[PDB]
Design a protein around this nucleic acid. Sequence first.
RNA 1: GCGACCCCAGGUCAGGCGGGACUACCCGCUGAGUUUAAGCAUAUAAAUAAGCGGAGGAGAAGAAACUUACAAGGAUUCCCCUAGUAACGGCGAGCGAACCGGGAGCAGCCCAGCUUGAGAAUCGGGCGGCUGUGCCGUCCGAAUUGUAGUCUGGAGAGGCGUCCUGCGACGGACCGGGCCCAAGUCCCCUGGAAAGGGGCGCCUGGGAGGGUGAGAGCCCCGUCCGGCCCGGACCCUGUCGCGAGGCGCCUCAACGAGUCGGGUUGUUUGGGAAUGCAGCCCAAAUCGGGCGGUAGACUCCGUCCAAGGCUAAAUACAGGCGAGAGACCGAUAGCGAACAAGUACCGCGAGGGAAAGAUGAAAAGGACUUUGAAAAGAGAGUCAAAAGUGCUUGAAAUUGCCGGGAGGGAAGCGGAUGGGGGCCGGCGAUGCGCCCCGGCCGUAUGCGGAACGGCUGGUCCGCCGCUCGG
RNA 2: UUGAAACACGGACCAAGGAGUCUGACAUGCGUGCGAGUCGACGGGUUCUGAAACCUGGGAUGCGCAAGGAAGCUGACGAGCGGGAGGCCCUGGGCCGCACCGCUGGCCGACCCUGAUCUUCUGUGAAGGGUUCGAGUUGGAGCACGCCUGUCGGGACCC
RNA 3: CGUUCGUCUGACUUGGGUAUAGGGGCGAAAGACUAAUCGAACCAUCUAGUAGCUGGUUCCCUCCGAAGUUUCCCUCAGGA
RNA 4: AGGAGGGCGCGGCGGCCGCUGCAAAACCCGGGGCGCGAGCCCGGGCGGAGCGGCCGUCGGUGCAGAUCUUGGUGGUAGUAGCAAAUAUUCAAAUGAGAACUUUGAAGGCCGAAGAGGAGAAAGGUUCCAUGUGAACGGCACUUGCACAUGGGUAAGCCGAUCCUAAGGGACGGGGUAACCCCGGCAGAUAGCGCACGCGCCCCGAAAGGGAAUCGGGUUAAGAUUUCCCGAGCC
RNA 5: ACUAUCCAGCGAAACCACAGCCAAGGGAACGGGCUUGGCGGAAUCAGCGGGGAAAGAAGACCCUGUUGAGCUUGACUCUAG
RNA 6: CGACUCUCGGCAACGGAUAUCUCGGCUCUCGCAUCGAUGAAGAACGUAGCGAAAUGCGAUACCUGGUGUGAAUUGCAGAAUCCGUGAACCAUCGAGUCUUUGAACGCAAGUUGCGCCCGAGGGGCCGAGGGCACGCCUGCCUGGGCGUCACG
Lengths: 253, 200, 127
Amino acid sequence: KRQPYAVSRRAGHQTSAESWGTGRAVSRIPRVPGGGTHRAGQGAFGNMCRGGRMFAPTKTWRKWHRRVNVHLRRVAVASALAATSVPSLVLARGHRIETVPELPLVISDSAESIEKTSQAIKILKQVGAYADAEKAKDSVGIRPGKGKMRNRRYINRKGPLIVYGTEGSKIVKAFRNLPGVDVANVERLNLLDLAPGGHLGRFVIWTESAFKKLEEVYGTFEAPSLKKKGFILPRPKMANADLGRIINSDEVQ
Amino acid sequence: VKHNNVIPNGHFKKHWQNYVKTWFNQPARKQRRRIARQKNAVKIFPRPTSGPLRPIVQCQTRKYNMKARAGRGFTLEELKSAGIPKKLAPTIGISVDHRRKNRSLEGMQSNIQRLKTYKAKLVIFPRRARKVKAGDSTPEELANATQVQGDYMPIARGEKRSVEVVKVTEEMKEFKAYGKLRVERMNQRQLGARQKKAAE
Amino acid sequence: MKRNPRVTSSRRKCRKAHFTAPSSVRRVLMSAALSSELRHKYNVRSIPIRKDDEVQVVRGTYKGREGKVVQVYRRRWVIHVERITREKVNGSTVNVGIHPSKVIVTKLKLDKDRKALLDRKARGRAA
RNA sequence: GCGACCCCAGGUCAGGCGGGACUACCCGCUGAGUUUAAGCAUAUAAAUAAGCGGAGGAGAAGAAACUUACAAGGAUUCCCCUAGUAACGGCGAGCGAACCGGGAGCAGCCCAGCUUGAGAAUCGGGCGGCUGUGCCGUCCGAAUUGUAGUCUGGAGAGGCGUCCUGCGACGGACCGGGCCCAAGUCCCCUGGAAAGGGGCGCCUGGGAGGGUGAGAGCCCCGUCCGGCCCGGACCCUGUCGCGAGGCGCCUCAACGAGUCGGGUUGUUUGGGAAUGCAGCCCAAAUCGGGCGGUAGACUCCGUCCAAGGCUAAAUACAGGCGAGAGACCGAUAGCGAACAAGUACCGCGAGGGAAAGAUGAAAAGGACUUUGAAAAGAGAGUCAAAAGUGCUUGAAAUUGCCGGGAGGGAAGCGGAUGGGGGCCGGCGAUGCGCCCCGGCCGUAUGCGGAACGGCUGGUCCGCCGCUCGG
RNA sequence: UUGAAACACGGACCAAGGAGUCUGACAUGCGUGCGAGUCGACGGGUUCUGAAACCUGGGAUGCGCAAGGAAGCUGACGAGCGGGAGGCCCUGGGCCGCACCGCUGGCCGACCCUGAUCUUCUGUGAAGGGUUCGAGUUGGAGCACGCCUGUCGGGACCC
RNA sequence: CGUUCGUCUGACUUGGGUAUAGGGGCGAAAGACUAAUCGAACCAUCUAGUAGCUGGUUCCCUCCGAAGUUUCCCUCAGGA
RNA sequence: AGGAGGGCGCGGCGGCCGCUGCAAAACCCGGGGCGCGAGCCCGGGCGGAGCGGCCGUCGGUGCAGAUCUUGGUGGUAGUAGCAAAUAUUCAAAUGAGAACUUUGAAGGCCGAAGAGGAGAAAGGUUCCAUGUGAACGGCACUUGCACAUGGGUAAGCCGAUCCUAAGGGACGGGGUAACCCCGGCAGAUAGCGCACGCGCCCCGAAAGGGAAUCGGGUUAAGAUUUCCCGAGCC
RNA sequence: ACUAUCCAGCGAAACCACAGCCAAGGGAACGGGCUUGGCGGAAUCAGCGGGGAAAGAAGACCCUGUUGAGCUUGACUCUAG
RNA sequence: CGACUCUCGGCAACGGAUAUCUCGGCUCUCGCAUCGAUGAAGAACGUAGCGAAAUGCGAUACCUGGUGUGAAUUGCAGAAUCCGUGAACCAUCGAGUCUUUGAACGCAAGUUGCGCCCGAGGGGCCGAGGGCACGCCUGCCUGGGCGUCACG
Ligand SMILES: [K+]
Ligand SMILES: [K+]
Ligand SMILES: [K+]
Ligand SMILES: [K+]
Ligand SMILES: [K+]
Ligand SMILES: [K+]
Ligand SMILES: [K+]
Ligand SMILES: [K+]
Ligand SMILES: [K+]
Ligand SMILES: [K+]
Ligand SMILES: [K+]
Ligand SMILES: [K+]
Ligand SMILES: [K+]
Ligand SMILES: [K+]
Ligand SMILES: [K+]
Ligand SMILES: [K+]
Ligand SMILES: [K+]
Ligand SMILES: [K+]
Ligand SMILES: [K+]
Ligand SMILES: [K+]
Ligand SMILES: [K+]
Ligand SMILES: [K+]
Ligand SMILES: [K+]
Ligand SMILES: [K+]
Ligand SMILES: [K+]
Ligand SMILES: [K+]
Ligand SMILES: [K+]
Ligand SMILES: [K+]
Ligand SMILES: [Mg+2]
Ligand SMILES: [Mg+2]
Ligand SMILES: [Mg+2]
Ligand SMILES: [Mg+2]
Ligand SMILES: [Mg+2]
Ligand SMILES: [Mg+2]
Ligand SMILES: [Mg+2]
Ligand SMILES: [Mg+2]
Ligand SMILES: [Mg+2]
Ligand SMILES: [Mg+2]
Ligand SMILES: [Mg+2]
Ligand SMILES: [Mg+2]
Ligand SMILES: [Mg+2]
Ligand SMILES: [Mg+2]
Ligand SMILES: [Mg+2]
Ligand SMILES: [Mg+2]
Ligand SMILES: [Mg+2]
Ligand SMILES: [Mg+2]
Ligand SMILES: [Mg+2]
Ligand SMILES: [Mg+2]
Ligand SMILES: [Mg+2]
Ligand SMILES: [Mg+2]
Ligand SMILES: [Mg+2]
Ligand SMILES: [Mg+2]
Ligand SMILES: [Mg+2]
Ligand SMILES: [Mg+2]
Ligand SMILES: [Mg+2]
Ligand SMILES: [Mg+2]
Ligand SMILES: [Mg+2]
Ligand SMILES: [Mg+2]
Ligand SMILES: [Mg+2]
Ligand SMILES: [Mg+2]
Ligand SMILES: [Mg+2]
Ligand SMILES: [Mg+2]
Ligand SMILES: [Mg+2]
Ligand SMILES: [Mg+2]
Ligand SMILES: [Mg+2]
Ligand SMILES: [Mg+2]
Ligand SMILES: [Mg+2]
Ligand SMILES: [Mg+2]
Ligand SMILES: [Mg+2]
Ligand SMILES: [Mg+2]
Ligand SMILES: [Mg+2]
Ligand SMILES: [Mg+2]
Ligand SMILES: [Mg+2]
Ligand SMILES: [Mg+2]
Ligand SMILES: [Mg+2]
Ligand SMILES: [Mg+2]
Ligand SMILES: [Mg+2]
Ligand SMILES: [Mg+2]
Ligand SMILES: [Mg+2]
Ligand SMILES: [Mg+2]
Ligand SMILES: [Mg+2]
Ligand SMILES: [Mg+2]
Ligand SMILES: [Mg+2]
Ligand SMILES: [Mg+2]
Ligand SMILES: [Mg+2]
Ligand SMILES: [Mg+2]
Ligand SMILES: [Mg+2]
Ligand SMILES: [Mg+2]
Ligand SMILES: [Mg+2]
Ligand SMILES: [Mg+2]
Ligand SMILES: [Mg+2]
Ligand SMILES: [Mg+2]
Ligand SMILES: [Mg+2]
Ligand SMILES: [Mg+2]
Ligand SMILES: [Mg+2]
Ligand SMILES: [Mg+2]
Ligand SMILES: [Mg+2]
Ligand SMILES: [Mg+2]
Ligand SMILES: [Mg+2]
Ligand SMILES: [Mg+2]
Ligand SMILES: [Mg+2]
Ligand SMILES: [Mg+2]
Ligand SMILES: [Mg+2]
Ligand SMILES: [Mg+2]
Ligand SMILES: [Mg+2]
Ligand SMILES: [Mg+2]
Ligand SMILES: [Mg+2]
Ligand SMILES: [Mg+2]
Ligand SMILES: [Mg+2]
Ligand SMILES: [Mg+2]
Ligand SMILES: [Mg+2]
Ligand SMILES: [Mg+2]
Ligand SMILES: [Mg+2]
Ligand SMILES: [Mg+2]
Ligand SMILES: [Mg+2]
Ligand SMILES: [Mg+2]
Ligand SMILES: [Mg+2]
Ligand SMILES: [Mg+2]
Ligand SMILES: [Mg+2]
Ligand SMILES: [Mg+2]
Ligand SMILES: [Mg+2]
Ligand SMILES: [Mg+2]
Ligand SMILES: [Mg+2]
Ligand SMILES: [Mg+2]
């Protein structure tokens, strides 16, 4: 999503300047030849000169965008989706889920019909997911550094991510003014939301329709079992990651 | 050059940096093309958005002999065999290609059939309230006439895969398929010498 | 979150538009809140400041003081209120400038266009 | 001599058209060298820079004298692939397209030639009228050395028979402009100022952004969702009211010349016995002409029909006018230019070309006394602060003063102690076991919740009623 | 620089600025996904935060899956042996032996030899080969992305 | 600049106007002069021209650690 | 020389955890410590509004040198130096202040191919008056060719203007891709007097050629012929 | 006679690793610094030309470089006329 | 004890780094298509109660007019205006004005230089105002040549 930046192609080269050579007790850098002004005789055309040219001027044909294999992107989303269901990894990301009834946190399809921000706040309180939204509402502050002076003045933590399925619901409107709370549709889940900052464990609230659709999308280990053509769920390298139950088994011991 | 590398061939000896073409306008090109497609669709509300009807042709050259695709337009002979005047065809959504010819019968028949299928699906609106014209449709047919999107008449590329089960006869064997290929190649390369001796 | 493609969120552009504003635009920018009694009577929230409006200062060191607007210095983004002054080192008197966003209008000067403006703003704030 | 025409001349004749400017993109010409080849001449740089012209909102190209060799495709343009490939190249250095295929976008038309002769049926201008980007009338002229109509190879003419062919009214869609459109300035504290902290509340399809005396959703402008009104554009489209062409059948059938093509010379190309172009010489045809990537002859085959004209869309855009954004720069950076910057200033000239942003919330910009020729000082006043008009902060080099220390033709430096100074108290302790004073309960119970293991047993709390050790 | 305290060069001092970067093509290594496949890169669909994201076009787009030959054109008829990690059996011996190394072969193609037989008379190929040649086969391992390093074209570390 | 010196009615000195412009002018000729620039002026651009040659090339610790020799090269201060 | 590993530091972006008007960043300090080190942590001060740490990722990311760039500052150093064109002195006045201003007196120089009186180029207000903060007038100044505020250039006769010189441009025509380069190559020469008659472009000189002015007076500054008086001329 | 010298006023620059007394030794083969000795006592003024291999200039002589340029010709390859 | 030199600290200087900013720059994307003989771009000179520049404008000269909004502009001073045909260093644009030039057009040009024609309005004189370049096209008027003819 990055926009390219570069310096001018002229940028320190629009002067007429030649080297004086040797025989005058000065360095051989090119110099402004005018006369009658302070610029006359000053260094030019050099990364080391005031008003010169940058060493390797940034050009616009840098590689800004990066290609990822479609299959590898689907594996990453499936791995980030499963991390959202174990509550320990969600807490490790900083989400406040102490009063969340069940972490997979499937909510009835009635929430798909709410259309007020106050209604959305009421829904979050019922499912125990409002302390996460409060933390995101707090901590909103000015970004330190130069990005302040650019068009990024405020930063905050992430709150819950709400997933709906109907494709026409007004739940998107009811939640879009809450800071740190994102709304996603199940058919176009984004890895940037599932693992913010490259850290797995986003706090996700599923509406029932979205959760039921979660098997149509992403399918299973069977080949034609999903919408994504040419994709199967990845297989773990270790069928049972319980190290204690393998080391302390009868056959091993 | 210092090691076991490929011989380098970099075509960067000219002022290539004044001729760099970036693609930062690629998502904007996609939106501009999408917007014009919606404007064109509204400009012709009931007419199909995919353009006029196209024929079926074989791609030329031996590499693409066996693939079919859309052509430019229908031949003047195909339109005549389907009953459609060549001046009327463009006005009712059929493409005309006076350059193309029909050398084989099967290619011609499948295109004539395509026009007949199109004519059974076409609904023509009268150019006035009075339906004095002949090719116009009944009021019921016009009353429910929507706009179709995409390819309403798809083209099949390549012969469909079909493994059959057959009994291998005693003539199917001992055919000597490699020998047939070699003798036919010889008959080709011996033709000029054979014709020379025949003339003498 | 803003949705309009034609509206700029650029901080540089918004500050340039604010400070390089013509006189007729500074009038809207230099608006004041109405008092509680006036807001209830007219069902409008804020109005552009005008000369000979009666005003109360609700922020700053002159908070609570009242007077009538003697000057609208649009070039300096300040209004001058009657008897809100200060002595110089030489003993002379100078009017103190206050931003109209830190006052409330208590009495309105109405000629014929003030009433028409109040009617327009009430209807939106009434429906 | 009167006349008709041809060619030409002169008009401040009546009405009209042209010249220059702009540079990003586009069309035409002209045209290097540095450079690479580790030298250098062909080659490369490059059919590039510079030079001279011509347009537009795009331009140019464009409807096969095209490809191919296939079961064949079917105008132009652009993208991907073809492909760093065929080819070219001191076959060195290097260079280098096209066909097929897949996409975006699709659209085909107008003439000249034979074709009124029962009627130049055509066009322009002056004048008049009107229903006015035009229509009609009249009079002059143009034109037969040819205006109009028919026809364009896909045809067509001719012959014979059947189907098809303006005005308005009211909206939509497109572009612009305006108006209106949520919620605290409630209480306490600190501060010059609350926009900070604490308490109590409200809006949110609005927590983009900005302003205001410090980190403001609710102080103000705005933002969201909408609503209302005004004005363009004269095409495109949605409902209302009022003979010719196509098709079937059957003897003519006209199609572009110093042009094609060939030779040679130069240049250009990937194009190689010659890719395009150009000069000069030769110089066509109509049972003909141009191609099928090796020059030639002959026999077949496939394929087109040049030398006249127009043509949207997909495409390009360091310029102009108007918008939006950014993992960009932050005043030696970013454009040369954040500022009266292509400015001051320099050169006869072509040209060259800077430095220079920040008081404070508000000038509240320092009254007045005294010294002094003045500039200024010393008091004093404003301010939260002198932050005291190049005034936010205010480093180093270097300098003055005060205090300390050392020094016989350098000083500084490493190690090791000492003398003197400057610092520090988590710099360093005052508790821990036994005994007279203050002050809490087992065991068992009723009850309430919630556990561990895989049906037994567990802890806690509050209440009782026996109990006594802490 | 063989050799610097040098009578060898640069350096009066201080502040700020100041030099192996970006892109293309390969290569080895490493990391990730998939795997005889892999790549969705140009387009299309969609996307109410979005120049993200998500879906989709390949029955042949690119690299792979097959060589050799200038070309015309042909195109792998299915291995043993020695040493070997590890596993197994008996009580040092035996069996099976991956990768890798070494040795000898077979098959494909260029060149040369060879020829029963069928056949459209010039083709075929039972057998039988070779001190020849191949970037071959008798192991499917590749494709895409990311990073460091190296070579090369570019201003190409800076002047 | 001082003193000294050459010429001084002629191939004399001088103002203004005008002509000749860069591989060009102009030259009683020194490669002289052509705006302090001349064995080819000055300005801008190509151009950040090329350089096997000179100078510089910015944080710390830890581990490993050279060569100035072979062959070929218009190769001899350079490369493979 | 060279390679590699592990760490330290700078600036962003995605995340996480915080700080700060009860004082952030930066800067200063014979303050205290931690680390072999790159560095880090704390204390005191100044300052008055923002800043940090951890994970990931990215980069215009670390200076003592380059006769390196720009800016600032030393020693040299109160030093080198202010010496051509003969020369000043006295009294007074003014003024805060006089070797340097003004007046008077004296002594000297330029010596009329001048250090005098007027012009052409070139300059452009420097001309005159009044006033004076600083700067400048390489010592000084009360003073000015500085600075500030005002004022000032009068033509029928003086010039330009008119004419032509060397020469320059240029219609048509010729060349040229165009820019542009060519004027004798002759082209119905574009008109002149009184229908009639005739018929061989412009620019270029304030020293060349040339219509017509004199004397006296007048201002702070003009007029060496412009204003006034008088007298003429074209 | 005018300077220099001394005063009032005004007031630069070149140059500068750090510095600045010698003998001998060794050492890049002529040291201010190193080694061994001689020595060596604040701060100042006028001069002076022995040293600082003093300054001024990336040696112009010489060589090298697959760097040029001006001129010549029986060099090579071209070219107006 | 002092002077000098060197050094350590405190305060004061000199200088303008650092830090925090930013109506500027740079990069990317989008939309639109509009200069001129009806005189453009560019150049000059003027123009305000107090202005030099920048910005604006053109003898109607920091502006006239229309429409919109609706009470300012301000550095100082004076005027105008307010329940209004109505303030504004306001916005916007349809009505106007628009000096000397410049492709630049009567001829020139280091010149406010040198010509010709018409002409309101008050024979002649004085006029305000305005014309007079080149190439070309259609038409028109006046012409030239035995160039091709016809009849007299
Ligand atoms: K692009
Ligand atoms: K008419
Ligand atoms: K705010
Ligand atoms: K024809
Ligand atoms: K050729
Ligand atoms: K043919
Ligand atoms: K600059
Ligand atoms: K301060
Ligand atoms: K001291
Ligand atoms: K040295
Ligand atoms: K390699
Ligand atoms: K494939
Ligand atoms: K061969
Ligand atoms: K490089
Ligand atoms: K003589
Ligand atoms: K003499
Ligand atoms: K003369
Ligand atoms: K020259
Ligand atoms: K060398
Ligand atoms: K980081
Ligand atoms: K005169
Ligand atoms: K004269
Ligand atoms: K002195
Ligand atoms: K010695
Ligand atoms: K030379
Ligand atoms: K000190
Ligand atoms: K700064
Ligand atoms: K003249
Ligand atoms: Mg020097
Ligand atoms: Mg710069
Ligand atoms: Mg910071
Ligand atoms: Mg090049
Ligand atoms: Mg006329
Ligand atoms: Mg033009
Ligand atoms: Mg070379
Ligand atoms: Mg070279
Ligand atoms: Mg050379
Ligand atoms: Mg060019
Ligand atoms: Mg245009
Ligand atoms: Mg066109
Ligand atoms: Mg055709
Ligand atoms: Mg094609
Ligand atoms: Mg390939
Ligand atoms: Mg080429
Ligand atoms: Mg092509
Ligand atoms: Mg295709
Ligand atoms: Mg005619
Ligand atoms: Mg005709
Ligand atoms: Mg017809
Ligand atoms: Mg017929
Ligand atoms: Mg509001
Ligand atoms: Mg609160
Ligand atoms: Mg503050
Ligand atoms: Mg030819
Ligand atoms: Mg040739
Ligand atoms: Mg050419
Ligand atoms: Mg052939
Ligand atoms: Mg033709
Ligand atoms: Mg044609
Ligand atoms: Mg065309
Ligand atoms: Mg487009
Ligand atoms: Mg543009
Ligand atoms: Mg700058
Ligand atoms: Mg900075
Ligand atoms: Mg000069
Ligand atoms: Mg502040
Ligand atoms: Mg300060
Ligand atoms: Mg200091
Ligand atoms: Mg040596
Ligand atoms: Mg050394
Ligand atoms: Mg030595
Ligand atoms: Mg040296
Ligand atoms: Mg030196
Ligand atoms: Mg630096
Ligand atoms: Mg074989
Ligand atoms: Mg063979
Ligand atoms: Mg360089
Ligand atoms: Mg002399
Ligand atoms: Mg010449
Ligand atoms: Mg001479
Ligand atoms: Mg000589
Ligand atoms: Mg030059
Ligand atoms: Mg050789
Ligand atoms: Mg060397
Ligand atoms: Mg210190
Ligand atoms: Mg930091
Ligand atoms: Mg950066
Ligand atoms: Mg750098
Ligand atoms: Mg430095
Ligand atoms: Mg260094
Ligand atoms: Mg230096
Ligand atoms: Mg400097
Ligand atoms: Mg100095
Ligand atoms: Mg002296
Ligand atoms: Mg002297
Ligand atoms: Mg004197
Ligand atoms: Mg004398
Ligand atoms: Mg005398
Ligand atoms: Mg005089
Ligand atoms: Mg005077
Ligand atoms: Mg002085
Ligand atoms: Mg003056
Ligand atoms: Mg005269
Ligand atoms: Mg004359
Ligand atoms: Mg003459
Ligand atoms: Mg001419
Ligand atoms: Mg003259
Ligand atoms: Mg004269
Ligand atoms: Mg005078
Ligand atoms: Mg000695
Ligand atoms: Mg020495
Ligand atoms: Mg000693
Ligand atoms: Mg001594
Ligand atoms: Mg001395
Ligand atoms: Mg000496
Ligand atoms: Mg001396
Ligand atoms: Mg040298
Ligand atoms: Mg030299
Ligand atoms: Mg060389
Ligand atoms: Mg050599
Ligand atoms: Mg040479
Ligand atoms: Mg030579
Ligand atoms: Mg203005
Ligand atoms: Mg003119």
